[PDB]
RNA sequence: UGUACAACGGGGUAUUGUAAGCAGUAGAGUAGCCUUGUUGUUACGAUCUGCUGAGAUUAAGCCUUUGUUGUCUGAUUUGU
RNA sequence: GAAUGUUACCGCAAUAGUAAUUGAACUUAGUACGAGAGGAACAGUUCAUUCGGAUAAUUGGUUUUUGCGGCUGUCUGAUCA
RNA sequence: AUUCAUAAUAACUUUUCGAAUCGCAUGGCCUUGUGCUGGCGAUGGUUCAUUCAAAUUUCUGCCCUAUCAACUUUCGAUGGUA
RNA sequence: GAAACUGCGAAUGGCUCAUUAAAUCAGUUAUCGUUUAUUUGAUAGUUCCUUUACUACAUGGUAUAACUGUGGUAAUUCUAGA
């Protein structure tokens, strides 16, 4: 039986990776897939205007 | 009614059986018999007396109580949402490892743009 | 007492306050890290198995 | 001549505190050997560990017994 | 313990003796009484003092259980005992 | 003034350090590749010297008391070897 | 640009004079008897380990904070689990 508050729900991992090889194993890509485009972004709406503020890639 | 434990021998004390000794440091020892009371007053150590639970623990006699624990071997089994990932589309992008020649296709346009910008800057300097 | 139960797979967690002392007597004389089946404490937790991670005493 | 009695034995309960013997790559160290080393073995060595909450004792005013072995007609006296 | 017919069981009860004692706390009530200061009592409850009769589950004491272990000195060739 | 500095041989170390770091400028060479080179700094780092110091240390030097004249050395007191 | 990790600093300063009579201290010597963050200036071509596929060097790996959320206690610059 599924408990009302635990298995009914699922919460998101608040942040995504920042290191390159961490991304590359997160998506299992390659030594060469150019991680810069596989970046997780988070579109916010400060007002009507929006922006994504993708973090960085260290290393 | 509680069943207290002997402070020297680990025996079980039933009500109305044995004695209690309050030491000057306000510690309470409980004895099931004059034997263990006397050995306490003779200030012997129960880890050296062979009939005591403490000795038997220290020497591993009747040691079938706890054996061991396992080691964890298993996956995560949850690609949970990264809160800006949209896990379904994130998996759709994870399967997008093939057809990665679009990466070089975009690198070609970036090379064209960087070279045009270099030429533009070299011309603007003049 | 109370149980702060957590399902790390979905990543969620919930409190459950508990009475019926002869249900929680199962936890007694157990260590942290040990496993317990939940039907002995509640058949709402039937077929589950929990692992004890910590706790906080009175005071 | 029988849910008889006794002596033994067994079991339980209790008391003590882990028997003797064997073994040990345990052991403060010491001497000797040579295959001369690569734990080298031999001997001496309080003690420790294991077989071992073991052994011993347990009714003489403890408990119980499907056990074994036995015993079970001697003498005196008494009458409204 | 002889004798009362013997023997056994269950009993009666003349006579004699006689045993229970004292106090505190709470409550009564800071009430009654009294100008006030002060300050009760009966009933009830819980405990205790002195005495007495039993008992030994527990605690304690006692130990020739010479029961178990340990220690000394010597004797049994050493060991075991 | 040295068994100083330094160097050289023999090996030893559970093995030290020898840049996976950051910013601005973005320039030069071509066999035009995200090719090869390249500036001004920051930070970090072994050793040496230096500096800021520390630690110990030499010599001489301190008030009143003899109604304190002997003290230290048991177990550190004075020295020696390790 | 809050928070938090990291690095530094917090051993300075300021207060007081209880101790302390060759002790501190003063001036004068020494370290050929040693430590020294920081500064300042100099200074590592040598490290692929059967070192001919053993290797990522256009550069390797894992945690964990802050953060999200669930809580404990009367209470503290308390804190657990995920
Ligand atoms: Mg420097």
From Swiss-Prot, chain A:
It is found in: Cytoplasm; Nucleus, Nucleolus. The modification Phosphothreonine is found at residue 45. There is a cross-link at residues 13, 31 (Glycyl lysine isopeptide (Lys-Gly) (interchain with G-Cter in ubiquitin)). Component of the ribosome, a large ribonucleoprotein complex responsible for the synthesis of proteins in the cell. The small ribosomal subunit (SSU) binds messenger RNAs (mRNAs) and translates the encoded message by selecting cognate aminoacyl-transfer RNA (tRNA) molecules. The large subunit (LSU) contains the ribosomal catalytic site termed the peptidyl transferase center (PTC), which catalyzes the formation of peptide bonds, thereby polymerizing the amino acids delivered by tRNAs into a polypeptide chain. Belongs to the eukaryotic ribosomal protein eS6 family. Present with 66000 molecules/cell in log phase SD medium. Component of the small ribosomal subunit (SSU). Mature yeast ribosomes consist of a small (40S) and a large (60S) subunit. The 40S small subunit contains 1 molecule of ribosomal RNA (18S rRNA) and 33 different proteins (encoded by 57 genes). The large 60S subunit contains 3 rRNA molecules (25S, 5.8S and 5S rRNA) and 46 different proteins (encoded by 81 genes). Interacts with snoRNA U3. uS11 interacts with MPP10. Component of the ribosomal small subunit (SSU) processome composed of at least 40 protein subunits and snoRNA U3. This is Small ribosomal subunit protein eS6A. The gene is RPS6A.
UniProtKB/Swiss-Prot annotation, chain B:
Residues 89-126 have a biased composition (Basic and acidic residues). Keywords: Cytoplasm, Phosphoprotein, Ribonucleoprotein, Ribosomal protein. The keyword Iron-sulfur does not apply. The modification Phosphoserine is found at residue 7. Disulfide bonds: none annotated. Coiled coil: none annotated. It is found in: Cytoplasm. Transmembrane segments: none annotated. Present with 247000 molecules/cell in log phase SD medium. This is Large ribosomal subunit protein eL24A. The gene is RPL24A. The chain holds residues 1 to 126 of 155 of the full protein.
């Amino acid at each position: 039986q599924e408990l009302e508050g635990l298995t009914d729900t699922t919460v998101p991992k608040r942040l995504g990776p920042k290191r390159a090889n961490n991304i590359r194993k997160f998506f299992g890509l390659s030594k060469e897939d150019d991680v810069r485009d596989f970046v997780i972004r988070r579109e916010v709406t400060k007002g009507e205007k929006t922006y994504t503020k993708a973090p960085k890639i260290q290393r | 009614m509680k069943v207290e434990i002997d402070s020297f021998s680990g025996a079980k004390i039933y009500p109305g059986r044995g004695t209690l000794f309050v030491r000057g440091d306000s510690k309470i020892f409980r004895f099931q018999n004059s034997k263990s009371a006397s050995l306490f007053k003779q200030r012997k150590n129960p880890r050296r007396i062979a009939w005591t639970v403490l000795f038997r623990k220290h020497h591993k006699k009747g040691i079938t109580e706890e054996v061991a624990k396992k080691r964890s071997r298993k996956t995560v089994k949850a690609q949970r949402p990264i809160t800006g990932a949209s896990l379904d589309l994130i998996k759709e992008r994870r399967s997008l490892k093939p057809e990665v020649r679009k990466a070089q296709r975009e690198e070609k346009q970036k090379a064209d743009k960087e070279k045009k910008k270099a030429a533009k800057a070299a011309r603007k300097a003049e | 007492m109370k149980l702060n139960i957590s399902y790390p797979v979905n990543g969620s967690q919930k409190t459950f306050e508990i009475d019926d002392e002869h249900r929680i007597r199962v936890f007694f004389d157990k260590r942290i890290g040990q496993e317990v089946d939940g039907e002995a404490v509640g058949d709402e937790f039937k077929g589950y198995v929990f692992k004890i991670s910590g706790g906080n005493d009175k005071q």
